[PDB]
Design an enzyme around this catalytic site. Structure first.
Site, mmCIF file in Angstrom:
data_model
loop_
_atom_site.group_PDB
_atom_site.id
_atom_site.type_symbol
_atom_site.label_atom_id
_atom_site.label_comp_id
_atom_site.label_asym_id
_atom_site.label_seq_id
_atom_site.Cartn_x
_atom_site.Cartn_y
_atom_site.Cartn_z
ATOM 1 N N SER A 1 -0.249 15.632 -12.239
ATOM 2 C CA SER A 1 -0.722 15.051 -13.584
ATOM 3 C C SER A 1 -0.860 16.278 -14.610
ATOM 4 O O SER A 1 -1.445 17.287 -14.032
ATOM 5 C CB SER A 1 -1.862 14.271 -13.865
ATOM 6 N N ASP B 1 0.950 -1.198 0.079
ATOM 7 C CA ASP B 1 -0.138 0.022 0.058
ATOM 8 C C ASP B 1 0.948 1.241 -0.080
ATOM 9 O O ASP B 1 1.344 1.678 1.123
ATOM 10 C CB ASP B 1 -0.932 0.019 1.311
HETATM 11 C C1 LIG Z 1 -5.217 -0.936 1.726
HETATM 12 C C2 LIG Z 1 -6.555 -1.049 2.130
HETATM 13 C C3 LIG Z 1 -7.159 -2.282 2.460
HETATM 14 C C4 LIG Z 1 -8.537 -2.323 3.032
HETATM 15 N N1 LIG Z 1 -9.261 -3.346 3.487
HETATM 16 C C5 LIG Z 1 -10.397 -3.323 3.914
HETATM 17 C C6 LIG Z 1 -11.330 -3.591 2.957
HETATM 18 C C7 LIG Z 1 -11.806 -4.565 2.580
HETATM 19 C C8 LIG Z 1 -12.934 -4.919 1.331
HETATM 20 C C9 LIG Z 1 -13.472 -3.703 0.914
HETATM 21 N N2 LIG Z 1 -12.988 -2.424 1.054
HETATM 22 C C10 LIG Z 1 -12.013 -2.431 2.311
HETATM 23 N N3 LIG Z 1 -8.974 -0.925 3.222
HETATM 24 C C11 LIG Z 1 -8.445 0.253 2.883
HETATM 25 N N4 LIG Z 1 -9.199 1.259 2.897
HETATM 26 N N5 LIG Z 1 -7.142 0.214 2.422
#
Ligand SMILES: Cc1cc(NCc2cccnc2)nc(N)n1
Ligand SMILES: Cc1cc(NCc2cccnc2)nc(N)n1
Ligand SMILES: Cc1cc(NCc2cccnc2)nc(N)n1
Ligand SMILES: Cc1cc(NCc2cccnc2)nc(N)n1
Length: 330
Positions: A199, A35
């Site tokens: 950009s 990330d």
């Molecule tokens: C890098 C990361 C992972 C994450 N996992 C949780 C998730 C699972 C399923 C759908 N949406 C969110 N949430 C975020 N904001 N960043």
């Protein structure tokens, strides 16, 4: 030194990507979401509330001869979408694709929000933004990249995400066989802790390129492309029947449509996102309404070049003293 690891989508629609990471001695391999929009390396663990674990592989520090509690340290992070996690901290040996860091802060989750529990394929996150965003208290900790940087052949990592296919994260070198043409580099601001850049504009399909500055972040952690409402409206206006819907909280297009490409500028260069990359499939099983991959940033506060954009390029995260970003077609 260098490292090279394959990153694999978690489903058929590239909803997220996972990369295997070795933690501890003997190694415990967990599949983490790399990330570039956050700066914590955190994992599901033997300390995670049992009801909040549903199929993930866990890190058990008591089984690692190199794990050490980081006494007194805690962490807690909220992502932009309401997803949250928190816990305590160990240091341990962490390896990615053959590149090893000793003494890496491994943040062990005691609590995770329901979205994490429900994502059985993601065992944690590995943050690759700037260490100024790391949430460990009272002693802020460094990212895996920051810890590895001095040992790397070159202080860089590269993201080469696949469309409906695996890709590669490389550390310490630029694979000149992985892209076409030349890499165009562009300035980064670290003032907010992100890989933030500007950009030079966009085009919709075969339309004329609009020169306009769009500040945003390169975020492997964000699945979709989030841009100003003006830009997003111009895109979806070229798809018959597309509309912004309040029930789904965003733009949906008829599953019978063919989507136009979207081009973004990097200096004088241009990255073309094919229309198919902007297709995330039915809003619910059996629906003929399909989820758009370009969405408005108006409610976020920042524009986000997420996976939809980044997977169209070979992306260099250059961590030299003055960081820069590089984009090439591939
Ligand atoms: C890098 C990361 C992972 C994450 N996992 C949780 C998730 C699972 C399923 C759908 N949406 C969110 N949430 C975020 N904001 N960043
Ligand atoms: C880490 C993560 C992201 C993701 N993004 C796509 C998504 C789908 C539906 C609603 N909101 C987001 N899906 C999952 N499974 N986990
Ligand atoms: C990724 C995706 C899936 C999809 N599903 C709809 C569907 C259902 C039945 C037969 N044919 C299509 N439609 C589109 N446009 N993209
Ligand atoms: C079917 C679906 C819904 C969804 N909802 C969350 C959302 C709403 C608006 C903007 N960004 C995320 N996200 C995805 N990828 N697929």
């Amino acid at each position: 030194s260098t490292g090279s690891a394959t990153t694999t989508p978690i489903d058929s629609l590239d909803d997220a990507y996972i990369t295997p990471v070795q933690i501890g001695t003997p190694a415990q391999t967990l599949n983490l979401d790399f990330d570039t929009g956050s700066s914590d390396l955190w994992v599901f663990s033997s300390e995670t509330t049992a009801s909040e674990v549903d199929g993930q592989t866990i890190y058990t520090p008591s089984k690692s001869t190199t794990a050490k509690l980081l006494s007194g340290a805690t962490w807690s992070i909220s992502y932009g979408d309401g997803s949250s996690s928190s816990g305590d901290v160990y240091t341990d040996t962490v390896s990615v694709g053959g590149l090893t860091v000793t003494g890496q802060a491994v943040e062990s989750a005691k609590k995770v929000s329901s979205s994490f529990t429900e994502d059985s394929t993601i065992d944690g996150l590995l943050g690759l933004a700037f260490s100024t965003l790391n949430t460990v208290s009272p002693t802020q900790q460094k990212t895996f990249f920051d810890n590895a940087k001095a040992s790397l052949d070159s202080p860089v990592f590269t993201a080469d995400l696949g469309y409906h296919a695996p890709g590669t994260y490389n550390f310490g070198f630029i694979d000149t066989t992985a892209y076409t043409g030349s890499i165009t580099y562009t300035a980064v601001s670290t003032k907010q802790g992100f890989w933030e850049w500007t950009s030079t504009g966009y085009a919709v399909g075969s339309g004329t390129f609009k020169s306009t500055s769009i500040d945003g972040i390169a975020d492997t952690g964000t699945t979709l492309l989030y841009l100003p409402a003006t830009v997003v409206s111009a895109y979806w206006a070229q798809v018959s029947g597309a509309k912004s819907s309040s029930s789904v909280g965003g733009y949906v297009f008829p599953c019978s449509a063919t989507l136009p490409s979207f081009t973004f500028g990097v200096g004088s260069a241009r990255i073309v996102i094919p229309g198919d990359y902007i297709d995330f499939g039915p809003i619910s099983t059996g629906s003929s309404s399909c989820f758009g991959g370009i969405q408005s940033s108006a409610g976020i506060g920042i524009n986000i070049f997420g996976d939809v954009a980044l997977k169209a390029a070979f992306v260099v995260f250059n961590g030299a003293t003055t960081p820069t970003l590089g984009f090439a077609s591939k």
